[PDB]
Amino acid sequence: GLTPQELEAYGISDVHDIVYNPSYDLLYQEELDPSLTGYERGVLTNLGAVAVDTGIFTGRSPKDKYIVRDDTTRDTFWWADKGKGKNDNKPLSPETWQHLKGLVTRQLSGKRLFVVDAFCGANPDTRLSVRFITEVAWQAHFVKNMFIRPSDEELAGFKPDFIVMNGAKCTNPQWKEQGLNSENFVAFNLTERMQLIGGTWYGGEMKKGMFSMMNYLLPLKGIASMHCSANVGEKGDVAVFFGLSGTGKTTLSTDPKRRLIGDDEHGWDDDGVFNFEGGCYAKTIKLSKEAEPEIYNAIRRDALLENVTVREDGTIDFDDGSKTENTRVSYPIYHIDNIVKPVSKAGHATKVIFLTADAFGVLPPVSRLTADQTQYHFLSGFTAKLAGTERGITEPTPTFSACFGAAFLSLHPTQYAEVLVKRMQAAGAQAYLVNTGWNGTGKRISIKDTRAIIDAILNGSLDNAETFTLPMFNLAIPTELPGVDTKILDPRNTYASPEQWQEKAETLAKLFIDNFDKYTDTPAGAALVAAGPKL
Secondary structure, three states: OOOHHHHHOOOOOOOOOEEEOOOHHHHHHHHOOOOOOHHHOEEEOOOOOEEEOOOOOOOEOHHHEEEEOOOOOOOOOOOOOOOOOOOOOEEEOHHHHHHHHHHHHHHHOOOOEEEEEEEEOOOOOOOEEEEEEEOOHHHHHHHHHHOEOOOHHHHHOOOOOEEEEEEOOOOOOOOOOOOOOOOOEEEEEOOOOEEEEEOOOOOOHHHHHHHHHHHHHOHHHOOEEEEEEEEEOOOOOEEEEEOOOOOOHHHHHOOOOOEEEEOOEEEEOOOOEEEOOOEEEEEOOOOOOOOOHHHHHOOOEOEEEEOOEEOOOOOEEOOOOOOOOOOEEEEEHHHOOOEOOOOOEEOOEEEEEEEEOOOOOOOOOEEEOOHHHHHHHHHHOEEEEOOOOEOOOOOOEEEEOHHHOHHHOOOOHHHHHHHHHHHHHHHOOEEEEEEOOEOOOOOEOOHHHHHHHHHHHHOOOOOOOOEEEEOOOOEEEEOOOOOOOHHHOOHHHHOOOOHHHHHHHHHHHHHHHHHHHHHHHOHHHHHHHHHOOOO
């Protein structure tokens, strides 16, 4: 379905063997080819799923992310070097881009190539048509899992909006003199409409780039673009769960009392909430069949395990984090029985949950937010980066991740906030802040407790429930909650010395205030200070 000549327009030469739109059967056979070496190699596990390793590239490389600054992006992108707020959108010259493109296209030239055409976005009117090019079968499999798989009729008329070229096997020897961070690179050019991957083998780089592109295009036309999971109740009530990976959004999304819309990347337009993806890239550290049965049962042929420990007998030790704590599996979304079909989308969200993995043990397990607190805490995005999720993170690392996805934002945080608020206001949606981090003793808040809290949110039992107010943060906390120990609802109770909550809360309050200061350069942002913590 694709000629060698078509690839030459992208700069790739000397290609005569193209594997276009590979089937899952073909990918499975290719991945088990014993002639593969190094990070190409795959092994078959007892669950029937192939497993691969990615070396040291066990999470994302934000410090290697670059966007060409040109007439397309100059005045619209949220640049790393132009604002008060830190971000990863580092500018790249057109000249250095051409160098990186040459490295990747030379690497892929003369090779047998896999080409996967797919969609990012469940809706035809706003989706991107993406063409992915790799020399490694498992990388093609990853994108087959993670993007929306077109029908034959859709492939017949396929016209790519973006090209993603995976050249993980190449590196940039000139990186030092070019002022770059390392010999690796994840580079984007919105004029040529291309993403390049060099050096890094982490699968997620192949999906979060297009997420960043959706995060550029959709809010500019009034559509929220959200780093969240999403599910729907029997009556059509949709919930979205914002958070960084490792902080509960995947686990809570597969709630057996709900039906899954998606894991990680969603839009919200006039019709409702829609998944961008065709699959889920779930963390597997400490996964168990008893605790996460839907996710566990999705691990079978056509799933792709990444960096998990496989024993000599082919069984998997999901508890082993010695390669990395950020072990992963990808699977097409239909590997979960309990999903929305025929398209991964539903109506407006009625419930908006912000997951905060609070390493200070200050915040309540659950708070019901006011309208202004919703905006304040969305822009703040206080949570934690968990080990391995970005390279060099070795332990839970507190962060203010604007919009609960700062690493993927292409526009200013307030642009995401304004669209989200407009959608929530139109729906009458209620927001909740849920601590999936740690309590006052340093113990991780139990998934059993968080699941019970989510249950109480989603059945509406908290919307008009009696509350008490937490000092300084001014958060409304329910006085009791079915299926949860009342004593945990007040975060002060789990401290051996409750005066220490006061000390840690003052410290965290100041961190929030200082982080939020940069948003107070407009009247609306200044007005939100009253909804944040007060010393």
